[PDB]
Amino acid sequence: MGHHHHHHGSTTQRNKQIAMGRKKFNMDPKKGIQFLIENDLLQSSPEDVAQFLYKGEGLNKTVIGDYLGERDDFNIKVLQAFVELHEFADLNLVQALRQFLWSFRLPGEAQKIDRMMEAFASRYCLCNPGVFQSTDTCYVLSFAIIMLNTSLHNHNVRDKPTAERFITMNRGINEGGDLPEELLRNLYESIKNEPFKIPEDDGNDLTHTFFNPDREGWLLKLGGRVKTWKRRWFILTDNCLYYFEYTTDKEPRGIIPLENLSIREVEDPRKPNCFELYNPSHKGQVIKACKTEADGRVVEGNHVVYRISAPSPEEKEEWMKSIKASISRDPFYDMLATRKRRIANKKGKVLSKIFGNKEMRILMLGLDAAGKTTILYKLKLGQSVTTIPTVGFNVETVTYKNVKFNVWDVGGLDKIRPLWRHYYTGTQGLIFVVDCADRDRIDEARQELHRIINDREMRDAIILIFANKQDLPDAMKPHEIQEKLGLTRIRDRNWYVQPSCATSGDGLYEGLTWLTSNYK
Ligand SMILES: Nc1nc2c(ncn2[C@@H]2O[C@H](COP(=O)(O)OP(=O)(O)OP(=O)(O)O)[C@@H](O)[C@H]2O)c(=O)[nH]1
Ligand SMILES: O=P(O)(O)O[C@H]1[C@H](O)[C@@H](OP(=O)(O)O)[C@H](OP(=O)(O)O)[C@@H](OP(=O)(O)O)[C@H]1O
Ligand SMILES: [Mg+2]
């Protein structure tokens, strides 16, 4: 182009809104219809909503029936307009029912069925005057036809009615008199030859493969220290906001754990539809995040805010609503920030560059509840804290006996584990933490450990196992852990099992001592 002017194409955003509206409708018809109206994709009149449902493009027909059956004044009007879009003139009652029953699936509730079939019968009689002496006659015969369809075509009904049985069953239905024999015979024969074809409701799959996502879409984002704008594909899921360079990427460019953040609308002189992620309680403090460098190594973010531009005000509103709903809120996060800041030493920079001290990159992994975060902050803050499950990661640098340990504590919940591999690059020591009282999950821990250490990026890492929770009754001892984690086989790697109690601190310094002694 020569000018990198950021322009998105209307086709992208409009098709996305169309797809969004349909998705919403299929979950909740009232909410989908409201979304489409707000997004100027549907007009608000009963007639306009009726045309939308009648076309029913990509709409669940059971959901259409649910909505049309409702007692609401608006819904009643939609229903009448819906039946008016059906042309029943010059069709017999079976043929008219075939048509109508293609357009929606009958709801289960008797009062809803009645409203819809009354509306149908009224429409049929207006289209075909003189055929039936009343709407009631038409309505009742419609159900005689439906019952016939069941009797003839459902194998659970043993005795199949003949034409003559169907004719005589309907004696007197025409306001006391009989309908024409040949009319009833024609209806019978039509149903006998072809059952009602019913649109059975389907299910569709998802486009991408990542974690089940709350929202995804393209946004422009401003850099941290270097204030440059980049187009990124964002995925919001499981209390984390991820971003990628391309939809085809299979690893994130950035990860933002949504811990005690807030959202504000901002005005920007050059980009439209902007909002910011920020921490209201710690103004000016760096937001926890990580991003990938050219060589694949994950590093900490430098943002005090995340300014983001959406391609439309509608998508801005969607993203703000979604992100707000996905924020993990908890005093724990404020507790960590406050305690860290108190013992924050500015001098550490001027001393770290002077001692020019080398250090050690650590990846700390293990099943959820193993004790990882407790260990991290026991080391970082010199105290045992009451933790909550980690949705993304925690990262802290700890100085211990002349070595600076950069420790990445990654969440161990099921859903997060496929992401562990992301953090491998650059790892010099693995800390694998195990709950020694959890015999139900020790084999699972073994499986995870070996997947990690067999990875091409983890071949050189020394391995420290924290055999944690030694304070608990009947907790597995280090020798049992050695066996149960299958470490005895592995004779070509440098590993050690350190007994620990993270809550008292027992064994933690001993583990860090081992790391320093064995790192080459
Ligand atoms: N009895 C006992 N409990 C511990 C010990 N260490 C940690 N815990 C407790 O175990 C629970 C989980 O500990 P966490 O540090 O949050 O575990 P985690 O590995 O970070 O879990 P994720 O964040 O899901 O990955 C918490 O209630 C801790 O207080 C220990 O040595 N003994
Ligand atoms: O691409 P250039 O112009 O060099 O600038 C980069 C990008 O804006 C990065 O965004 P992305 O990671 O999406 O590529 C950003 O990382 P963030 O992802 O943390 O915003 C960097 O922030 P700093 O490293 O803070 O300067 C910034 O230096
Ligand atoms: Mg944790």
UniProtKB/Swiss-Prot annotation:
Span of domain SEC7: 25-154
Protein topology in the membrane: Peripheral membrane protein
Outcome (variant: residue 232 to A): Abolishes phosphatidylinositol 3,4,5-trisphosphate binding
One GO location term (cellular component): cytosol
Main location (coarse class): cytoplasm
Binding site for a 1,2-diacyl-sn-glycero-3-phospho-(1D-myo-inositol-3,4,5-trisphosphate): 221-228, 232, 243, 253, 302
Top-level taxon in the UniProt lineage: Eukaryota
Outcome of mutating residue 340 to A: Impairs autoinhibition
Known outcome of mutating residue 303 to A: Abolishes phosphatidylinositol 3,4,5-trisphosphate binding
A Gene Ontology biological process term: regulation of ARF protein signal transduction
Keywords of the record: Cell junction, Cell membrane, Coiled coil, Cytoplasm, Guanine-nucleotide releasing factor, Lipid-binding, Membrane, Tight junction
Region annotation (C-terminal autoinhibitory region) ranges: 339-347
Domain PH, first and last residues per copy: 212-328
A molecular function GO annotation: guanyl-nucleotide exchange factor activity
Reported impact of residue 291 to A: Abolishes phosphatidylinositol 3,4,5-trisphosphate binding
Substitution effect: residue 243 to F: Reduces phosphatidylinositol 3,4,5-trisphosphate binding
Disulfide feature: none
Subcellular localization, as worded in the UniProt entry: Cytoplasm, Cytosol; Cell membrane; Cell junction, Adherens junction; Cell junction, Tight junction
Domain notes: Binds via its PH domain to the inositol head group of phosphatidylinositol 3,4,5-trisphosphate. Autoinhibited by its C-terminal basic region.
Quaternary organization: Interacts with TAMALIN. Interacts with FRMD4A. Interacts with FRMD4B.
Job description of the protein: Promotes guanine-nucleotide exchange on ARF1. Promotes the activation of ARF factors through replacement of GDP with GTP. Plays a role in the epithelial polarization.
Protein name: Cytohesin-3
Organism: Mus musculus (Mouse)
Full protein stretch here: 63 to 399 of 399
